[model samples]
Target: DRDRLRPPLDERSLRDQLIGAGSGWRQLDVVAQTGSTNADLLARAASGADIDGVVLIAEHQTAGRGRHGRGWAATARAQIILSVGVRVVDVPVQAWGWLSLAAGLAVLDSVAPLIAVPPAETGLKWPNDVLARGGKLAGILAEVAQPFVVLGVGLNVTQAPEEVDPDATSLLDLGVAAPDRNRIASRLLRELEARIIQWRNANPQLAADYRARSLTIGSRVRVELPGGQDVVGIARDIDDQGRLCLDVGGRTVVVSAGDVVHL
Candidate 1:
């Protein structure tokens, strides 16, 4: 029945496409299914082993997660589901807060170009969601293990409306032809490889680009903070530490994490 949609990703062809040249992937793995790609990679990181650039992909994810512990479920062969394990190996461990945002930047830069959409129509939300026409199209999750990080990128290709949140969307929903899953994977990793190698963001490069691509900035937002607190403000800028600097009245608050809802 699921074959009615598409065959499992061509493993050999994908691995071949990813192994050589500028593909940033050191290794790629195709798991038939997993509870969570992020969890899988973190277990390996916990093993005290070298797990750099190891990519894990699954078509059927029964148990994935979004920020603030929300469950993420996706249909088989209908989305781009993958996790990446990497280490910066640099002098910026203090910049750890920026890791998730960097992953968000990579996914936005990689996937947006493949589909035809005005730059204004598709870009980034505050912390980690990619949007199209003001709807959620893709999301990035960054899990930490001190110096090592596990980053997951998920994009919807063919999903029923109810499968996603009310504000969630897919590539096809935006009138763009759906690219092959493998093709999207390869392009994403390659872009990630290029940008991540040059990843040491000891400057405003990341901040400026994030600001430019941001959907939240200059918009009134209601962010639900942890412990059920909420802050209402205008998002002014994303700081170098990846914190969203919100302007509340004449005061300022730099939030490290929250659920952002534009009002």
Candidate 2:
């Protein structure tokens, strides 16, 4: 049975681990299926509701999306699809782009210990993708609905080889032993709590810490700008403002928005 291979996340245990006890998480909900966790939370925020600190997960995301409106379709129970709603009162509006980077760091911290891969082979790819063995292991997307931001994450867990894209990977694919969805979800939320706090407090080391775990730095890349122009360069560093600095043909170009592809 598929259930034997990939089990449903344990909700009771998740509540026990995440609720109260000094945890900043206000609420955690897991649904059997949903169109998109981000969409659900975004709608609440759009309605002028207080969605801050709310976390929603869908076992099967029917219409999940990534940056640039890209679709993220995954097998039921084989991935972790969740979104967290946060209010950005303390963090400056200019620094909001760094929220997804913070979430990427949290995802790595959550799953790094579970994988047996060489440490050098795993880390984050620029703004939002998490990589293991140079293959995408997870994706993060943050949507702004005024004062509220819905941070969504989709992490591959126990998907079979044939069930995954050639350029993507799962925890099980990285030699994790019978990875448990509940455990991963719990660890993810815990790590997210710490990162979000740092982000809200405007941590000065966010850029440095992100650079330390970055797989994009020192790599040749092609960035697709919003105007359909492409800039091929070496990713040198990220500025204090969290924008990517590229060395393009002996000139420096600081990019605030673009889709990066490793060349």
Q: Over all chains combined, what TM-score does candidate 1 have?
A: 0.91
lDDT of 1 by residue, 166-216 (tens): 777776666655457777777777766655654564546766677778889
Give me the runs in candidate 2 sitting further than 4 Å from their true place: 1-3, 161-164
Q: Give the number of the best model, judged by TM-score.
A: 2
lDDT of each: 0.77, 0.86
Lowest summed lDDT across 10 adjacent residues in model 2 is found at 158-167
Count of backbone clashes, every candidate in sequence: 0, 0
Highest lDDT: give the candidate number: 2
Q: What is residue 31's positional error in candidate 2, in angstroms?
A: 0.2
Error of 1 at 215 (Å): 0.8
